[PDB]
Amino acid sequence: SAMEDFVRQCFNPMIVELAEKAMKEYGEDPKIETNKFAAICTHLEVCFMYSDFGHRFEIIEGRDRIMAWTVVNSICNTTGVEKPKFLPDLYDYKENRFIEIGVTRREVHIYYLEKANKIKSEKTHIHIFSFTGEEMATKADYTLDEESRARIKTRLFTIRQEMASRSLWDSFRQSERGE
Ligand SMILES: Cc1nc(-c2[nH]c(Br)cc(=O)c2O)no1
Ligand SMILES: [Mn+2]
Numbered sequence: 037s038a039m040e041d042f043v044r045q046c047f048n049p050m051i052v053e054l055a056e057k058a059m060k061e062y063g064e065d066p067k068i069e070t071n072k073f074a075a076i077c078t079h080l081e082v083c084f085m086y087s088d089f090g091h092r093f094e095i096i097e098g099r100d101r102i103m104a105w106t107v108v109n110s111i112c113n114t115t116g117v118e119k120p121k122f123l124p125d126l127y128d129y130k131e132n133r134f135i136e137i138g139v140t141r142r143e144v145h146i147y148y149l150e151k152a153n154k155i156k157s158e159k160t161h162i163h164i165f166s167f168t169g170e171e172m173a174t175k176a177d178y179t180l181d182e183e184s185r186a187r188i189k190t191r192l193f194t195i196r197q198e199m200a201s202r203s204l205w206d207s208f209r210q211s212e213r214g215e
């Protein structure tokens with residue numbers, strides 16, 4: 037499958053290795069579930085960019101369940117913020133809130149509604165990015181400055197265009213794996 041080669045060519049080896057772990061540890065083959073592989077890579081990269089564009093952010097995503105829950109519990113004990121039922125992706129120290137990052141191939145409002153209905157906890161802030169350069173955040177609070185969100189949007193659009201240049205974007209968009 038060309039999707040695997042595209043993933044290995046456009047994503048950092050660290051991100052690819054983390055995605056391979058998240059998949060093979062839980063019984064999934066990145067050679068079979070290629071769309072999910074690409075989606076996990078993209079989501080991890082977006083989370084890491086979000087965090088780097090802050091210090092201000094503590095990355096929960098990219099860790100094993102043990103370490104992620106350890107970090108969440110430590111943040112809850114220090115700041116007193118309520119413990120999320122589902123592992124969020126980041127913690128904002130400035131705004132003092134957990135953040136769930138979503139990357140979708142569908143409309144941002146549909147994915148935002150799905151995410152909100154999933155995590156029935158208003159305190160976890162939701163930020164949805166799309167591959168067409170659109171975003172949607174809880175209360176329209178995008179947390180980051182314009183430049184950081186622009187960089188993330190450019191990266192996402194570039195991933196989509198690279199997929200399209202290899203005739204991979206149609207299969208990826210018509211699939212909902214990873215969201
Ligand atoms: C636990 C745990 N779940 C996730 C997760 N799963 C999917 Br599917 C889409 C996401 O955006 C996301 O953050 N990360 O940690
Ligand atoms: Mn997550």
Ligand SMILES: [Mn+2]
Nearest residue numbers: 125136137138
């Ligand atoms: Mn997420």
